[PDB]
Tab-separated table of C-alpha atoms in Angstrom:
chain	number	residue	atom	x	y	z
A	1	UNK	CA	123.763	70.191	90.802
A	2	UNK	CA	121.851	67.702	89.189
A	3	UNK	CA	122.001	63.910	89.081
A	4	UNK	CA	124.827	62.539	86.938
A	5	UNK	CA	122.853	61.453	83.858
A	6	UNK	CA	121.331	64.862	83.865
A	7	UNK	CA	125.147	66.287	83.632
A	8	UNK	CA	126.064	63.819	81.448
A	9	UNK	CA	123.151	65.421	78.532
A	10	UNK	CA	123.011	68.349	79.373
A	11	UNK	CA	127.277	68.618	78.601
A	12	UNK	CA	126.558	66.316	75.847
A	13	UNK	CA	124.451	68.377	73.961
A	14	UNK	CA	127.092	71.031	73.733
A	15	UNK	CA	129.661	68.067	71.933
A	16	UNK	CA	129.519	69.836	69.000
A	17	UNK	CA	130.132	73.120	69.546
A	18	UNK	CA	132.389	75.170	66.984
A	19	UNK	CA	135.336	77.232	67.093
A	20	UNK	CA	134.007	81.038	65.945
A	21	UNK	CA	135.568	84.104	65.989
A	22	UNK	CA	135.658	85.802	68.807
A	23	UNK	CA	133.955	82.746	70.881
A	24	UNK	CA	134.978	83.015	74.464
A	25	UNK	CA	136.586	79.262	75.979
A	26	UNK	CA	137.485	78.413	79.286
A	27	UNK	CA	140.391	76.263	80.016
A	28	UNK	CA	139.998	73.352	82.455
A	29	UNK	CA	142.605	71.089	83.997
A	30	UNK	CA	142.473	67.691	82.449
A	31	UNK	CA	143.313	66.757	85.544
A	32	UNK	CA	140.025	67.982	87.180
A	33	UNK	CA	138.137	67.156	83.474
A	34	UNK	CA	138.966	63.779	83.291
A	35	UNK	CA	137.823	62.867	86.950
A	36	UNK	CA	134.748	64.867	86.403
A	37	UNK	CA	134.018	62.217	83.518
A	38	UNK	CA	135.018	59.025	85.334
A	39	UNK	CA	132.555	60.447	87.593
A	40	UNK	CA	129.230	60.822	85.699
A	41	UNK	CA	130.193	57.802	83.124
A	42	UNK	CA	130.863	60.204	80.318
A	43	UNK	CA	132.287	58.240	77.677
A	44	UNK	CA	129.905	55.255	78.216
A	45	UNK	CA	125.990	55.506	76.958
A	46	UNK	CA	124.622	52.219	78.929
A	47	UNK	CA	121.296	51.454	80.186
A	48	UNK	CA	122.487	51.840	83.498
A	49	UNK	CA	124.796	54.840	84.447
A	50	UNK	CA	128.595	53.957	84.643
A	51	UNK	CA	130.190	56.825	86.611
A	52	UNK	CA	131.879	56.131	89.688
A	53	UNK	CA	130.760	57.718	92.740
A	54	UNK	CA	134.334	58.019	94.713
A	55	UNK	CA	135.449	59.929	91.893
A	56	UNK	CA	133.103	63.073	92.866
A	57	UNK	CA	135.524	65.672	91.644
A	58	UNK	CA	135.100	68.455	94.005
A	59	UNK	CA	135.298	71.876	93.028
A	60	UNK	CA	136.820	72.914	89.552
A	61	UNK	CA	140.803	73.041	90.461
A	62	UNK	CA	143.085	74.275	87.788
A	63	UNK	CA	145.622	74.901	90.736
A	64	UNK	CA	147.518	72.517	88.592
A	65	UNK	CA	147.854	75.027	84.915
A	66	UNK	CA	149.039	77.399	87.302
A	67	UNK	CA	152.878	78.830	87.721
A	68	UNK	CA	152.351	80.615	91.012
A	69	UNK	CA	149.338	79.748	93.451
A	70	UNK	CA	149.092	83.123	94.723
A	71	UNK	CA	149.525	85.052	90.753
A	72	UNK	CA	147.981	82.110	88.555
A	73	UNK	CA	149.939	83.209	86.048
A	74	UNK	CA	149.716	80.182	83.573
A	75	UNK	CA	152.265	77.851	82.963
A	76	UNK	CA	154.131	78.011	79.793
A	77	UNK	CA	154.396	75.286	77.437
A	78	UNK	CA	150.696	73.573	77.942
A	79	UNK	CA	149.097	71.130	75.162
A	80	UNK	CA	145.678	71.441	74.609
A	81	UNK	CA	144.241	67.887	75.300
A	82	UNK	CA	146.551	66.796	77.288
A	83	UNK	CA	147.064	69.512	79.762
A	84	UNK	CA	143.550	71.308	79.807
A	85	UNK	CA	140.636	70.861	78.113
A	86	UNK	CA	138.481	73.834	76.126
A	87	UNK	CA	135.429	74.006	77.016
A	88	UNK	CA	132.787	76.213	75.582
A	89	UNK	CA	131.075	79.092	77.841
A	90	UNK	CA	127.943	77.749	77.953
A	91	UNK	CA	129.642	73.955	79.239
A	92	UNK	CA	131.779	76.324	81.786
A	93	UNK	CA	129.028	78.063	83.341
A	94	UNK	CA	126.861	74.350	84.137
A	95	UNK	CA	129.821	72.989	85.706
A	96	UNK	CA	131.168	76.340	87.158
A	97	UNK	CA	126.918	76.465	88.317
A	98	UNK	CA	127.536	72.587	89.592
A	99	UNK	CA	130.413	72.073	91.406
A	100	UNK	CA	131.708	75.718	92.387
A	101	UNK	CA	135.395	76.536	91.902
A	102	UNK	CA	138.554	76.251	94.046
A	103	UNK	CA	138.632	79.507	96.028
A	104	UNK	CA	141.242	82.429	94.447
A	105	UNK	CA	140.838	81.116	91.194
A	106	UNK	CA	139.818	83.437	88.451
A	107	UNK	CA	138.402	81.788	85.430
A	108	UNK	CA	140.825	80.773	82.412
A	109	UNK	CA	139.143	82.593	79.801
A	110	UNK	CA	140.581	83.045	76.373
A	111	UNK	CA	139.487	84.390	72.841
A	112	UNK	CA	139.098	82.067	69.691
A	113	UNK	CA	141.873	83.850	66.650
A	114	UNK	CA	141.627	83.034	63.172
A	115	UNK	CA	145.272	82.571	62.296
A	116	UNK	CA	147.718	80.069	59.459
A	117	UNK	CA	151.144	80.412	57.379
A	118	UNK	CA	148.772	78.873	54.546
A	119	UNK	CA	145.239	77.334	55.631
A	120	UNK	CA	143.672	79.304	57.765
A	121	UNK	CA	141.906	78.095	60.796
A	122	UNK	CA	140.263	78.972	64.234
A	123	UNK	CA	142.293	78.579	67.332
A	124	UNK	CA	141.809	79.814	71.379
A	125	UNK	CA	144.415	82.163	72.193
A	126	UNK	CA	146.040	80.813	75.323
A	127	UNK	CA	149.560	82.398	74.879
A	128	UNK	CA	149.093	86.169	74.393
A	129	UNK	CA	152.261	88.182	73.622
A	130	UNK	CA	153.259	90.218	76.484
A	131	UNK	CA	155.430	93.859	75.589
A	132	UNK	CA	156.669	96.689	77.907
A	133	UNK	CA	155.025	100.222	76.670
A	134	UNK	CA	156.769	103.456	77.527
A	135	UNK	CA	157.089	107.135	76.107
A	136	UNK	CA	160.108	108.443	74.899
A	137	UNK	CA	160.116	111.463	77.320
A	138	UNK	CA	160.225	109.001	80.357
A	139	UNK	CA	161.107	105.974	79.749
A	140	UNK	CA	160.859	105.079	83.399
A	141	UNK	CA	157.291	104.952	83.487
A	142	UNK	CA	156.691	101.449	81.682
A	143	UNK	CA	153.774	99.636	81.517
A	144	UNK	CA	152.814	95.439	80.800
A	145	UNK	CA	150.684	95.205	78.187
A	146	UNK	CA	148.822	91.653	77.143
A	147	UNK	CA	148.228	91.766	72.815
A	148	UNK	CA	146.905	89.028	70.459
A	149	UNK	CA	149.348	87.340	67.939
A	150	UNK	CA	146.393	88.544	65.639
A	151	UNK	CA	146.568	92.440	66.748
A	152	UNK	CA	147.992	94.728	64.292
A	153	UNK	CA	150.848	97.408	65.196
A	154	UNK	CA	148.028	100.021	65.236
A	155	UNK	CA	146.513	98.230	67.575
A	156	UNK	CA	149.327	98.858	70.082
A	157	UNK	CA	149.949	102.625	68.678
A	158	UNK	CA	146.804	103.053	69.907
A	159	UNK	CA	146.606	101.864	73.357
A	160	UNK	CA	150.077	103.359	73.818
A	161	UNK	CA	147.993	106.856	72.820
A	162	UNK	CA	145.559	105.775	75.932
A	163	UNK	CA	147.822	105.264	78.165
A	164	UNK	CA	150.401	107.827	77.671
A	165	UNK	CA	147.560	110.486	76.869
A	166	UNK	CA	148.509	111.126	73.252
A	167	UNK	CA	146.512	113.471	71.543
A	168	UNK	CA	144.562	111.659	68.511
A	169	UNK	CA	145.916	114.699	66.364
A	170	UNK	CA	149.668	114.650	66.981
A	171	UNK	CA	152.386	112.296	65.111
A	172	UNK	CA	153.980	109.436	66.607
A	173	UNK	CA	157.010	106.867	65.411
A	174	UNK	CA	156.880	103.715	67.007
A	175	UNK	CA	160.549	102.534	68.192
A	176	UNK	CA	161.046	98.881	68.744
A	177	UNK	CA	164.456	98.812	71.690
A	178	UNK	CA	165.443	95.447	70.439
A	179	UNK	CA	169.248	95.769	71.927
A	180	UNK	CA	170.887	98.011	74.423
A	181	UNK	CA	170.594	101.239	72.676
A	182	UNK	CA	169.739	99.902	68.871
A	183	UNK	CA	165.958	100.781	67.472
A	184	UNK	CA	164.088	99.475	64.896
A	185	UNK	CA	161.279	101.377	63.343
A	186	UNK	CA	157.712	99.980	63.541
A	187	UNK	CA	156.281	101.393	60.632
A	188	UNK	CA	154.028	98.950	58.628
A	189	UNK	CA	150.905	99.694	60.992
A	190	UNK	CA	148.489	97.481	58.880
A	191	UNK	CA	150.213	94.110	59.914
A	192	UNK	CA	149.890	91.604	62.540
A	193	UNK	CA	151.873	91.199	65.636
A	194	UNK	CA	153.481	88.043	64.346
A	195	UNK	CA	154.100	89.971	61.173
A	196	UNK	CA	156.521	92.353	63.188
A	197	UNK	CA	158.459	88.986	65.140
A	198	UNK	CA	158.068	91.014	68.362
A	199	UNK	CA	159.473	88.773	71.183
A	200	UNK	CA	157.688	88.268	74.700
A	201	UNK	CA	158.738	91.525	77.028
A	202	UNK	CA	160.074	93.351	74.454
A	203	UNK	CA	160.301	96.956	75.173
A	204	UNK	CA	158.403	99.412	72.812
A	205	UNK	CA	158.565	102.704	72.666
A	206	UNK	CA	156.503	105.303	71.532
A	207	UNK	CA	158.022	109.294	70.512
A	208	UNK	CA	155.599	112.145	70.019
A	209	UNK	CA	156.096	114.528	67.377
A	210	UNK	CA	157.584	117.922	69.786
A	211	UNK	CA	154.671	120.521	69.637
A	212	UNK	CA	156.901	122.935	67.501
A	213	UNK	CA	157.440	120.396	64.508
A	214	UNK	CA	160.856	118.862	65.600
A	215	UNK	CA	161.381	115.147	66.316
A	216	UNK	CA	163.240	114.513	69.716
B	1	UNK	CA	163.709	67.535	34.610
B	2	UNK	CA	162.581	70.703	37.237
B	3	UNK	CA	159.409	71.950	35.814
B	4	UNK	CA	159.009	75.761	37.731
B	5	UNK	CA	156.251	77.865	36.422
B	6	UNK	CA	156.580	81.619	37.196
B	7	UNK	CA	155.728	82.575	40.919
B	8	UNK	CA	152.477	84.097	40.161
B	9	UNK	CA	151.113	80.580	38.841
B	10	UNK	CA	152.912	79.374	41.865
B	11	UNK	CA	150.928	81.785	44.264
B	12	UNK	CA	147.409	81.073	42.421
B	13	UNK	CA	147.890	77.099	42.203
B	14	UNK	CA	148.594	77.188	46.161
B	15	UNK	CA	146.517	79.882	46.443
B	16	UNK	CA	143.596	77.544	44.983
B	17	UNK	CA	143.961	74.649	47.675
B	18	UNK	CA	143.355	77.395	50.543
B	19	UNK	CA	140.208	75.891	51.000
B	20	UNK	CA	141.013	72.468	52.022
B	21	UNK	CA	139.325	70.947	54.996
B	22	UNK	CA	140.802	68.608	57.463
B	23	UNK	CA	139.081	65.426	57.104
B	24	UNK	CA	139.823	61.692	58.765
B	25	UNK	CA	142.557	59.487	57.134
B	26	UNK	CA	143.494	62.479	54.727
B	27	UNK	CA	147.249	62.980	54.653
B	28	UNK	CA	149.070	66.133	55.160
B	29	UNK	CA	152.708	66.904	55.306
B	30	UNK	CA	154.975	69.566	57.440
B	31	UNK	CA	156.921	71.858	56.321
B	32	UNK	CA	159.649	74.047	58.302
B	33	UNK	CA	157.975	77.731	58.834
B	34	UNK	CA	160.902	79.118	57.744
B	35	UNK	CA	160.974	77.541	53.923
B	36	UNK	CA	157.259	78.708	53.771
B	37	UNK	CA	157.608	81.705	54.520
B	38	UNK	CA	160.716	82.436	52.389
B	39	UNK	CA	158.587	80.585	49.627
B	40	UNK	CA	155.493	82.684	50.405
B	41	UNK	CA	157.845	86.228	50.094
B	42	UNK	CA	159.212	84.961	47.486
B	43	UNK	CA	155.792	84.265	45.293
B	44	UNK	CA	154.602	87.356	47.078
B	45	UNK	CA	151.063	84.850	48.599
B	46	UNK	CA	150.225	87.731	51.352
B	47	UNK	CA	151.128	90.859	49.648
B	48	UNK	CA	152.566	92.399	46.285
B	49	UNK	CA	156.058	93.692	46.818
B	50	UNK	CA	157.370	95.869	43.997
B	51	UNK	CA	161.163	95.154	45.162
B	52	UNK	CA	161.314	91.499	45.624
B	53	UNK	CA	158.567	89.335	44.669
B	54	UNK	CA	160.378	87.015	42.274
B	55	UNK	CA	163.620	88.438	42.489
B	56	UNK	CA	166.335	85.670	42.442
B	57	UNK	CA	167.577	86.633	45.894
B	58	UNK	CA	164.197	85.290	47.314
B	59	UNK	CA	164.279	82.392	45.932
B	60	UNK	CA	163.809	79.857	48.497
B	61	UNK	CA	165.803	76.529	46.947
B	62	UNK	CA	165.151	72.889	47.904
B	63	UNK	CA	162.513	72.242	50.620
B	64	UNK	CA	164.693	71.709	53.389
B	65	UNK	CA	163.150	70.074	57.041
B	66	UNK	CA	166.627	69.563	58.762
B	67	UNK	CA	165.430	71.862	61.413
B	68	UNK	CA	162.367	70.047	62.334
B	69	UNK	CA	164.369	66.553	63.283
B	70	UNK	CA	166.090	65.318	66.644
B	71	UNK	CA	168.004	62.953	64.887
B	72	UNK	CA	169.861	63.947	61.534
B	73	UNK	CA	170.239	60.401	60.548
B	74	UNK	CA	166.994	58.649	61.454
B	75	UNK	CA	164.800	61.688	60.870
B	76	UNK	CA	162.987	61.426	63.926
B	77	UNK	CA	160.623	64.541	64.213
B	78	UNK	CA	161.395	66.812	67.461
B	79	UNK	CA	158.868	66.891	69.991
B	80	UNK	CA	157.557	69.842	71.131
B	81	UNK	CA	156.886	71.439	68.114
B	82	UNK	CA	154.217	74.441	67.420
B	83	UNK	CA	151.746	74.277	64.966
B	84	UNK	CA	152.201	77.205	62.788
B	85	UNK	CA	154.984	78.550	64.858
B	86	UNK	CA	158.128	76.127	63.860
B	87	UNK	CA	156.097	74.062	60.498
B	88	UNK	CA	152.633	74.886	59.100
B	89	UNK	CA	150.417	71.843	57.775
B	90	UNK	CA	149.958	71.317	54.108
B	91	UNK	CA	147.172	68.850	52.167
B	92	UNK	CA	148.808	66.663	50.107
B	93	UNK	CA	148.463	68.175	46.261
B	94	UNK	CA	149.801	71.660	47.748
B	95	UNK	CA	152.755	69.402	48.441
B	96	UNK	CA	153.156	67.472	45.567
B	97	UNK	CA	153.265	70.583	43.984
B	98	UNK	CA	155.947	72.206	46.012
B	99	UNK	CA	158.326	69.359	45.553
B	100	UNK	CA	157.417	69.240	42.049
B	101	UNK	CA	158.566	72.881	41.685
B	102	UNK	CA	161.680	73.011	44.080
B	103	UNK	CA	162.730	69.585	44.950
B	104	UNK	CA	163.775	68.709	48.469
B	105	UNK	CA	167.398	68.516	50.093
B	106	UNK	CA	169.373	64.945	49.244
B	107	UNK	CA	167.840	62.032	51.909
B	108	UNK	CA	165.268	64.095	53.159
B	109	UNK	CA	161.466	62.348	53.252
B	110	UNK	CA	158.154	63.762	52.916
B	111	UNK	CA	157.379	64.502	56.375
B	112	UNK	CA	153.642	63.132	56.383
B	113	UNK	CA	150.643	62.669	58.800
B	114	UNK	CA	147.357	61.857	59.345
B	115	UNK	CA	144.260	63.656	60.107
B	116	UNK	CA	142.009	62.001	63.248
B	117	UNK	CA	139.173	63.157	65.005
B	118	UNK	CA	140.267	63.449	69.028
B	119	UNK	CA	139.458	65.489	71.781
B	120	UNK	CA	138.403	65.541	75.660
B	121	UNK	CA	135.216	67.019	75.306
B	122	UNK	CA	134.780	68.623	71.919
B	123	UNK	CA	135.452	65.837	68.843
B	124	UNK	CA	137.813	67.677	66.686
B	125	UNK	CA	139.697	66.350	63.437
B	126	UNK	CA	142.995	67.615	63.749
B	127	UNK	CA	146.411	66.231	62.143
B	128	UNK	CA	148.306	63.987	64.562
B	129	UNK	CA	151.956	64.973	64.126
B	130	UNK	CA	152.392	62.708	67.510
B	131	UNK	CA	151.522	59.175	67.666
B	132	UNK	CA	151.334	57.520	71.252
B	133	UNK	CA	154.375	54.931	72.039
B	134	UNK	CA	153.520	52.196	74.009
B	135	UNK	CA	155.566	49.479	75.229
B	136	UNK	CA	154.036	45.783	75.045
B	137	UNK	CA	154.611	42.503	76.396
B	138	UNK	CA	153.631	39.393	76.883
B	139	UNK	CA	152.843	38.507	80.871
B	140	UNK	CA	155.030	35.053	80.487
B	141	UNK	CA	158.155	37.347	79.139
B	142	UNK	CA	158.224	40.426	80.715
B	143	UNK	CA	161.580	41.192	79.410
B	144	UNK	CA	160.333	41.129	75.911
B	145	UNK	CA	158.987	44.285	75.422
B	146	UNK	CA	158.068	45.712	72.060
B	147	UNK	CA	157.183	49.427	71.246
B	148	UNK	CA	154.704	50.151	69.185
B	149	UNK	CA	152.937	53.817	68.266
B	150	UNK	CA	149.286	54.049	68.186
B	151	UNK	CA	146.754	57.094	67.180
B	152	UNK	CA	145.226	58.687	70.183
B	153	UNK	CA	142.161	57.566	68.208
B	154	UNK	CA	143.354	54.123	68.416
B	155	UNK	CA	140.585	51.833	70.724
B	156	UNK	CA	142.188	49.571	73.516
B	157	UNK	CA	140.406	46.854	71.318
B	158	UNK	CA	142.996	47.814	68.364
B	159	UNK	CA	145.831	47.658	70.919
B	160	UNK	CA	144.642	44.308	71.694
B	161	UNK	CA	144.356	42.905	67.765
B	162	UNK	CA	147.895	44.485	67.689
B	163	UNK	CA	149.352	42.479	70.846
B	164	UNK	CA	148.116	39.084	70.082
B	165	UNK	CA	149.324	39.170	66.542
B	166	UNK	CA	152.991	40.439	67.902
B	167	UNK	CA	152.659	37.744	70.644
B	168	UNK	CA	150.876	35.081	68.768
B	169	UNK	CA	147.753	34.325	70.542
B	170	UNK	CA	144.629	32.405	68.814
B	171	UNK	CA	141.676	34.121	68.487
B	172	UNK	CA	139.412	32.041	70.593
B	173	UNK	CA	141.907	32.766	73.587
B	174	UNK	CA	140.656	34.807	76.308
B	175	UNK	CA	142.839	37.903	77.144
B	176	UNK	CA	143.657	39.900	80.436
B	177	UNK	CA	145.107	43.778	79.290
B	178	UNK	CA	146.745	45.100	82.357
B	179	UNK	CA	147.582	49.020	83.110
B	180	UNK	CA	150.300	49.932	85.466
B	181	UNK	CA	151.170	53.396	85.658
B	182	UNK	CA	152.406	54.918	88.658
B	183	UNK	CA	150.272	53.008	90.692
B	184	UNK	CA	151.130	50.262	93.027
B	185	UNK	CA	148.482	47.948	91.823
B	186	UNK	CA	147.772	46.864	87.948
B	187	UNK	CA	144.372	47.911	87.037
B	188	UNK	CA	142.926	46.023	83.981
B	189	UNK	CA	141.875	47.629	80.617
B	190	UNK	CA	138.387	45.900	80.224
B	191	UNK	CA	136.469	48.596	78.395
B	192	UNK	CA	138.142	47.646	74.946
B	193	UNK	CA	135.468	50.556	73.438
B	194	UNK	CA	137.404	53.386	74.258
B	195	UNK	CA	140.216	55.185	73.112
B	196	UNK	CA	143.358	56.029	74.008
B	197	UNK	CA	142.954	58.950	75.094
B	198	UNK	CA	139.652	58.355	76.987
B	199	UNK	CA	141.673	55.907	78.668
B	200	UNK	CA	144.522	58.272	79.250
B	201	UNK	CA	147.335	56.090	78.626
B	202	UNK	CA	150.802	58.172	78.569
B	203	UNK	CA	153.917	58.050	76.275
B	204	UNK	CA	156.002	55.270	76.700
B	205	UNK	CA	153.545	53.775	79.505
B	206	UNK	CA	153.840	49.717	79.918
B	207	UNK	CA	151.100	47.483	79.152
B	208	UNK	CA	151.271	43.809	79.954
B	209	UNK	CA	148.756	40.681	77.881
B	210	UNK	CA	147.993	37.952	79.833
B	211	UNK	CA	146.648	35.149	78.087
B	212	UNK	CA	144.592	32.777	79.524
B	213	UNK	CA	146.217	29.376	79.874
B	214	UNK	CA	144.750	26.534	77.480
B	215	UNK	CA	143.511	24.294	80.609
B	216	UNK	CA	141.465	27.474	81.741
B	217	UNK	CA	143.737	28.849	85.268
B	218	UNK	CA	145.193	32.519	84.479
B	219	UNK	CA	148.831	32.782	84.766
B	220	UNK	CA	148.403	35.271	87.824
């Protein structure tokens, strides 16, 4: 870990970095962030250094974004610059390099989306929507899955194929169980997940065309 | 007095401010999610629909942002809201021409915000649909206390103009800012260079100006 100045250029030059497609972020507690620039005199470009050396932040704790210590499962309802802070891989990895992490603590990585009603424009993915898979001929056997609000319905179709072992060739209908025993039909494969208003833990299932032609 | 053109004009005037950037001081106003995307069926924006694009059973009405305030009366905006989720953002001829076309429900005003540049670590502009409220007050009457709301991008320096104005104090008068929050002690706001949020001031947070007396002691 270098001196502070050097950490306070080296994260500077990545300021500027843009939200792309597909651009991998890592979420930070602001907690942890804040301290971190206390520390190395961030926000303060003096001829003499400003940080303050009692604030040495330690490892990189996000204990705090956390619902469970032992799952780390993320809290719901965070706001991006004021909970956490995004930072870019390349700013993750020097301060991940720097300072080491709290032990346990798996990286908060997340995807950049484009998404918009109107405008469109580049977000990170923090909240993905979580559904319950299963096969119609046992509907015991269901499995979590994680999607993006920017997946389409194929998209799930197809994992469900994976993990069901579907063959590629035979016909499906994709049932969305959104009450006791009342279905809707996912049909319009081409649109987003948002597109479909599928709730968190919603229960999906998928029904194989019967080998003979029939439709259980 | 409505002037309505048919909803494919509709779909390629909107269509045609798409590109808009987010830029500081523009102005951009909310609109509840579910209006837009009535509106947006209705004009068909995302897809053709043989059935019902223009049908009058679509049609959307008067822009209608009940759902988006606290208080029915004083049209305070809930907090907690979701970008995209429960309003989307629009620039401000996309909703001139919106209001223009459909009108808005009786009372109801333009829900409108600013665009600042903020951020922890990456500088992004972004529209602030949340101002910061701060309590302020004089250190000789502590039970004065105005609120006032400030940008995030706001500079402790601007917080200071604002405070001696309110409180009357003459510009060659030297100033204390104090900071207590959560604490035990007050810590002093000296570096009147940084913002808000570099400062990380919280909503509602207490902030006390102590001026210095005219023979040269400080009050405390």
């Amino acid at each position: 870990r270098p001196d502070v100045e050097t950490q306070k250029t080296e994260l500077g030059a990545l300021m500027g970095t843009t939200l792309q497609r597909g651009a991998q972020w890592y979420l930070i507690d602001s907690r942890w962030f804040k301290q971190w620039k206390k520390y190395v005199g961030f926000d303060s470009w003096d001829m003499y250094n400003v940080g303050e050396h009692n604030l040495f932040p330690g490892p990189i704790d996000n204990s705090g974004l956390f619902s469970d210590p032992e799952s780390q499962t993320l809290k719901e309802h965070l706001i991006d610059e004021l909970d956490y802070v995004l930072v870019p891989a390349e700013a993750w990895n020097k301060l991940l390099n720097w300072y080491g992490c709290v032990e346990g603590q798996q990286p908060i990585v997340r995807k950049v989306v484009e998404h918009g009603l109107f405008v469109k424009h580049c977000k990170v993915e923090v909240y993905l929507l979580e559904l319950k898979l299963c096969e119609n001929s046992d509907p015991t056997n269901v499995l979590s899955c994680h999607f993006s609000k920017a997946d389409t319905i194929a998209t799930i179709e197809k994992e469900m194929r994976k993990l069901f072992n579907i063959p590629a060739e035979r016909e499906t209908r994709l049932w969305n169980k959104y009450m006791s025993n009342t279905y809707e039909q996912l049909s319009k494969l081409d649109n987003t997940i948002q597109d479909a208003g599928l709730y968190q833990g919603q229960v999906l299932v998928i029904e194989p065309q019967n080998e003979d032609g029939t439709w259980p």
